[PDB]
Amino acid sequence: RRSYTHAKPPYSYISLITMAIQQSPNKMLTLSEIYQWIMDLFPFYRQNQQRWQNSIRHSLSFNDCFLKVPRSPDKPGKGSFWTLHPD
DNA sequence: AGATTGTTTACTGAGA
DNA sequence: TCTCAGTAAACAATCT
Ligand SMILES: [K+]
């Protein structure tokens, strides 16, 4: 068995996150759902996950276009949801 | 206790 | 030359 090389798809981390959220049924995703959507669709991101996931977490917090949404206390779980800022 | 999630600072290189 | 994107890492809050 051998490994194969994929080229990075042409999207910034902001675009990848935005597309992930826009296509989801509730217009909001957890962090791991975002990782999973990106890996499901772009096989380039099935490698170096320690790196690019650090960068996704950084971009979610650093950029004002991403908004954290708390879980309702009646539905507790790991992490919060991420949605797009209403502007 | 350990791992994940989230925030923050500091670089650094791409590109205009 | 200057902005922004992506990397690295420290550290804390909050999960398992
Ligand atoms: K944010």
Residue numbers in the entry: 152 to 238
Could you pull the original sentences from the published paper?
Forkhead box H1 (FoxH1) is an essential maternal pioneer factor during embryonic development that binds to specific GG/GT-containing DNA target sequences. The members of the FOX transcription factor family share the presence of the forkhead domain (FH), which interacts with DNA (InterPro entry IPR001766). Most FOX proteins recognize the canonical forkhead DNA motif TRTTTRY (R = A/G, Y = C/T). In contrast, FoxH1 recognizes the TGTG(G/T)ATT sequences in several cis-regulatory elements, such as in Gsc, Eomes, Nodal, Mixl, and FoxA2, to confer activin regulation in vivo.
In contrast, FoxA2, also a pioneer factor that binds to canonical forkhead motifs, displayed the opposite behavior and selected only for DNAs with TT sites, even showing a decrease in its melting temperature in the presence of the GG site. Also, EMSA assays indicated that FoxA2 binds weakly to the TGTGGATT site whereas it interacts with high affinity with its forkhead site. To explore the impact of the protein-DNA interactions on the DNA topology, we compared the DNA shapes of the FoxH1 complexes with other FOX structures available in the PDB and with the pair of complexes we determined here for FoxA2 using Curves+ 43. Small differences were detected at the major groove, whereas the minor grooves were found to be slightly wider in the FoxH1 complexes than in other FOX structures. A similar absence of interaction between Asn and the G-C pair could account for the DNA binding preferences of FoxA2. The structural information we gathered for the DNA binding specificities of FoxA2 and FoxH1 FH domains is compatible with the hypothesis whereby FoxA proteins substitutes for FoxH1 preferentially at TT sites, with FoxH1 remaining bound to GK sites even when the concentration of this protein is low.
